[PDB]
């Protein structure tokens, strides 16, 4: 279902047939762990098993003490968000007097409940671990206080297993200043996450999509340490909401297009700068310039709208005709004609310039193409690697079909002597404007030279009168004078 087109004229390629999964919002929930107040076992003895129990209890005490301390090309065009503003707003509300009390009330008899917080927002709260019950009601009544002993070694191992999740959560928060991403299976086990998905303000299709891609969901989620007080550890999990799914996406690949004159300094280059992911969205096109931060699983593209621009749908016309009048296609210019490759979804663009050796090879290192100077392309059918200079690239082996669209390299349409050749954030129109200004400045300079030339300069200063003849000053006496004859 994936197809690819290479546009020889602009050294670029579009891969299409993908489907969207865009993070459009956030869903916040409160995870709680119930704690015991026990600080010590107040007996002394020689029993080794209780000494092991006491060491584990120090780990619990120290983890509580730690959490208490915690409680107290076109990327530059993007806006600037605050990724955990939604979760931090929930966390800060949990610090208000009364809030933890509501959560304990709602969770006294059930492990999951919706709580109405002070600011009016309601959130799922759950209880994923009850260390208060285990320590107070399962471990302590087993300790014989007179001999300060316990009978069975398996109590040590059960305490270890019970305490472990709390220690790992504390470790993760302590090295991440209270905010972790991705969300680990200690923050939220797989089935806890799948249950929270089943309870989100989303359509059945969206529940299905996130449930089938929980590993992506995890990697886009945050866990935010909030409060530890009154026998409660609480942290906020901030989960992505994919409010746009199943919309068409396509990826644009671009590489430098240069003239191929032999003299090493004589060439001019342009590159399309609009590389990245494009997805249909609400009658517009969401454009993600940093394609590397999107995540692709098979034909599904997971992008975050925080890293996008909202563009008119006619931005695709740059792939039809870069000189189209409806959309001003983005480009940069240079005189640096260095060789490289861009590995696309179904092939490889090769920008080969100068003396650089550029080839494409099969599985057996058989060379099936030797590139000449210029921008060219091979598909991944029968090609495993491309080599540009000293760099070997493996090509993607995904299944699909590539189409080579012949066309004249547009760099050939530009006059190199008026070419604005160091533009980083330009466009077809802006480059045309600059060229026009350059041409007008030359023409105005010539029209000034013409208009000023051909006026007369000063005549000799010698007491003689002069007239004008054949572009020269000539003596008036030449035409008035008679032949002097002094005589006697």
């Amino acid at each position: 279902n994936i197809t690819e087109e290479f546009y020889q004229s602009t050294c670029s390629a579009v891969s299409k047939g993908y489907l969207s999964a865009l993070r459009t919002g956030w869903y916040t929930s409160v995870i709680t762990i119930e704690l015991s107040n026990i600080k010590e076992i107040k007996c002394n003895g020689t029993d080794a098993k209780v000494k092991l129990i006491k060491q584990e209890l120090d780990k619990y005490k120290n983890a509580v003490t730690e959490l208490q301390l915690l409680m107290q090309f076109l990327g530059f065009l993007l806006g600037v968000g605050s990724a955990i503003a939604s979760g931090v707003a929930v966390s800060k509300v949990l610090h208000l007097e009364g809030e933890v009390n509501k959560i304990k009330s709602a969770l006294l008899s059930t492990n999951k409940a919706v709580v109405s917080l002070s600011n009016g927002v309601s959130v799922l709260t759950s209880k994923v671990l009850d260390l208060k019950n285990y320590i107070d009601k399962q471990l302590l009544p087993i300790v014989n206080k007179q001999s300060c002993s316990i009978p069975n070694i398996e109590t040590v191992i059960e305490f270890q297993q019970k305490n472990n999740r709390l220690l790992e959560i504390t470790r993760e928060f302590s090295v991440n200043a209270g905010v972790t991403t991705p969300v680990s299976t200690y923050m939220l086990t797989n089935s806890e996450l799948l249950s929270l998905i089943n309870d989100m303000p989303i359509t059945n299709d969206q529940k299905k999509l996130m449930s089938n891609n929980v590993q992506i969901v995890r990697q886009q989620s945050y866990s935010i340490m909030s409060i530890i007080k009154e026998e409660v550890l609480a942290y906020v999990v901030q989960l992505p909401l994919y409010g746009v799914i199943d919309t068409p996406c396509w990826k644009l690949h671009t590489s430098p297009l240069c003239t191929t004159n032999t003299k090493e300094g004589s060439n001019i280059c342009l590159t399309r700068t609009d590389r990245g992911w494009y997805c249909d969205n609400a009658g517009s096109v969401s454009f993600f310039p940093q394609a590397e931060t999107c995540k692709v699983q098979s034909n599904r593209v997971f992008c975050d709208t925080m890293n996008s621009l909202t563009l008119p749908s006619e931005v695709n016309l740059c792939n039809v005709d870069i000189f189209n009048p409806k959309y001003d296609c983005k480009i940069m210019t240079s005189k640096t004609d260095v060789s490289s490759s861009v590995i696309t979804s179904l092939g490889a663009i090769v920008s080969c310039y100068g003396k650089t050796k550029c080839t494409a090879s099969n599985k057996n290192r058989g060379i099936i193409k030797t590139f000449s100077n210029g921008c060219d392309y091979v598909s991944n059918k029968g090609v495993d690697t491309v080599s540009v200079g000293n760099t070997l690239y493996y090509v993607n082996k995904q299944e699909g079909k590539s189409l080579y669209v012949k066309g004249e390299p547009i760099i050939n349409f530009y006059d190199p002597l008026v070419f604005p050749s160091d533009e980083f954030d330009a466009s077809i129109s802006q480059v045309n404007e600059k060229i026009n200004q350059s041409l007008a400045f030359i023409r105005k300079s010539d029209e000034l030279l013409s208009a000023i030339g051909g006026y007369i300069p000063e005549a000799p200063r010698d007491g003689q009168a002069y007239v004008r003849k054949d572009g020269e000053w000539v003596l008036l006496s030449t035409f008035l004078g008679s032949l002097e004859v002094l005589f006697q």
């Epitope: 579009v14 006619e314 695709n316 005709d321 189209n324 189409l403």
Partner: nanobody
Framework: QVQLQESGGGLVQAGGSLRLSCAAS????????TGWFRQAPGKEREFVAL????????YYADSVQGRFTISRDNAETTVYLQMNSLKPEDTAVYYC????????????????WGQGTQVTVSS
């Protein structure tokens, strides 16, 4: 995810005229290459004509050159195929198709297709 629906097919007699139309649903044709294809009984689809914006780049197959006219309204909601001087040859099911990417004639690279409307030229 533009949706397409053709109209205008029917019986016409050789030398006459016929206009097909194709309406966009879900979103407009804005930024989409729209092409017409036709498939006669026993043959595979054949490229007819394409356009990319209202009053923009056109291209016809050499067989329809001079006789067919493709266009799109300024609102980019409908693409039209005006067929003048019809020949029995021209009898086929005519399909509307749309795509991102460039203006190509390869049917396999068109992602969105109409339902097809029948054109019959009698002699």
């Amino acid at each position: 995810q533009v949706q397409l629906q053709e109209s205008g097919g029917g019986l016409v007699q050789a030398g006459g005229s016929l206009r097909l139309s194709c309406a966009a649903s879900g979103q407009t044709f804005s930024g989409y290459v729209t092409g017409w294809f036709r498939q006669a009984p026993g043959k595979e689809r054949e490229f007819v004509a394409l356009i990319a914006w209202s009053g923009g780049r056109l291209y016809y197959a050499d067989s329809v050159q001079g006789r067919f006219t493709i266009s799109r309204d300024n609102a980019e909601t409908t693409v039209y195929l005006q067929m003048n001087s019809l020949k029995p040859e021209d009898t086929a099911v005519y399909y509307c198709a749309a795509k991102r990417g460039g203006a190509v004639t390869a049917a396999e690279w068109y992602d969105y297709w109409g339902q097809g409307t029948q054109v019959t030229v009698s002699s």
